[model samples]
Target: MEYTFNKLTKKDVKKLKVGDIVYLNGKIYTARDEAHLKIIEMLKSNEKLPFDLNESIIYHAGPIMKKVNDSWVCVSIGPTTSARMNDVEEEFIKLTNISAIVGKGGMKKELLKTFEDYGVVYLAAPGGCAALLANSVKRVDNVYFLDELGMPEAVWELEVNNFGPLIVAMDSHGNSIYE
Candidate 1:
């Protein structure tokens, strides 16, 4: 089956199953290792997060960007390994209320249960197509932790239209392609 999400919510991904194909629209946030840890730390310390995670889709990406006439343009954007955040993944999910995770290489097995509990789905972004993926990004809305964490570790807020050929590698029903 195929699904297209303009804006993701936990309920929006509840019906998806492992092996389903999905396309995304609207906005998605990018966060890698440092960003994930930072988010957890911020939440635990009662610090306000830069952007809302509720009902949102978080992409595990680091985009190459350039300033073009005062606006940022994504030169290329692609998924990093999802397993890199496995240590913090569960806790991040519990606190963030995010609906979907987009990345390459499916996450750890333990997160399957976490995904079930939290009503989250893992969408696998295609690897080796970084440049192509950037084409779908309509704009760079904002970025957080640019100076503190560096470019790849920054959390990028992007607006996208028809932004994927994402594979449903893990679903809210405790199903994962890895399993």
Candidate 2:
């Protein structure tokens, strides 16, 4: 089946099943290893985050961005290994309530449990399509931790149109393409 969503809602997520194709036309945040750790740490300390994670989508990517005429341009945005952040991803989702995770090389099978409890889905973006992915990113709205964590490890809030051709590798009902 195919679906297109501008935002991820609990009701919408429930209807998705493994192997379904989806496209997102809205904002998405990029968060990799360090960004994930910092987000969880700041939350535990009761520090305010730059963006709301609840019902939002987080893509595991470290995109190559450029500054052009004082505006950020997405040079290439590709999926990083979702497995790399597996250590902290479960708690990150629990505390943040994020709805979807986009990345390559699917995460730990154990996360299927947390995905079920929190109504989350795992999307696998095609690898080796970095520049092609950037074509979908229309604008860079904001960024966080750019100075400290650097570009790739920072949180890049992006405004996108037809942002994906993602496959549902894992669904909220404890089903996984990996398993």
Candidate 3:
């Protein structure tokens, strides 16, 4: 069953074993290397966060876009390599209450340790299917910090429905399918 962000409870989390399939339905934000660096800089300088991080999922994607009418629509939005985030992952996890990380590829040992310590999970979306992935997005709520860092670094709030065939590659219990 699809789970909304708020619908996920402690019990629900406990029920989720490693390798469970999930479809995340709620508001998700996109962020990648540049965006993440900016976010960290903001954090270090004690600036206000762009968005609330609690129970949020951060997708490692920079979507391709096309203007439809006056609004922008995603043409393709697929996961990027998670390794690029290695330098920032641990601190990012500690500073934010992000419960999940969605992307392609696996993370490092430190990130895995942080995931176990912080009760976070790592979810994997299929790689290289950007257009099909965008179709799962029901709507885009808002975008932030676009002009400062361009498309890849902007924060995008997307409302998604049945937005995956996500696999729990890594879990809070220090277990990973990749290992």
Candidate 4:
């Protein structure tokens, strides 16, 4: 099924099953290790995140960018090893209202409980398809922590269109492709 970014909800997330294909259009966020850690700290300290995470989607990506025509173009945007975020994944879900996680590899089995609790899903994208994935990114919208975290670890808000052939590896119903 194809989903626009803003339309995700608990009902929508729970309806999906493992091995379902999902295409995403509209906004998505990118964050890597450092950005994830920082977000956890900010939320733990009762600080607010810069953007709204309500029913949002987070991409486990760090894009390669080039300045083109005064705008940052996504030269390549690939999913990182998602398990790297597993330690903080469940907590991160609590801190924010994100509904789906998009990345490569899979997180820990324990997070399936978290998924059921939150009506969230995990979509798996192909790794090392950076250049191909870039094709779906319409433009860079907003960026954060660029100076502090640098490009790879920065948080990026991006506009995407039909941005997937994502496999539903984990669903809110406690079903997982891995286990």
Provide the lowest-lDDT 10-residue window in model 1: 5-14
Error at 89, model 4, angstroms: 0.3
lDDT to native, each model: 0.90, 0.92, 0.79, 0.87
Q: Write the per-residue lDDT of candidate 3 for residues 1-179, one digit (tens) a residue.
A: 34434344444554565678888788888989888888888888888896887767889898876678888787788999988998998888787768788898978766777887777788889997888999988887778888887776688888888877888878787777778
Q: For model 3, name the residue pairs that clash.
A: none
lDDT of 1 by residue, 1-179 (tens): 99888867666788899999999889899999899999999999988997999868899998988899998899999899999999999999999988899999999988989899888999999999999989999999998899998877899999998987999999999888987
User: Could you tell which candidate, 1 or 3, scores higher by TM-score?
Assistant: 1
Q: In model 4, which runs have C-alpha deviations exceeding 4 angstroms? A: 1-6
- The C-alpha local distance difference test score for the whole of candidate 3 amounts to 0.79
Model 4, 22-55: lDDT tens per residue? Answer: 8888889997778889998998899988888877
Candidate 3 ranges beyond 4 A from true positions:
1-11
Cα distance off (Å), candidate 1, residue 114: 1.2
Question: What TM-score number comes out for model 3?
Answer: 0.91
- Count steric clashes of candidate 1: 0
Model 3: per-residue Cα lDDT at residue 152: 61
- Summed backbone clashes in each candidate are 0, 0, 0, 0
RMSD of each: 0.9, 0.8, 2.0, 1.5
Which candidate achieves the best lDDT against the true structure? Answer: 2
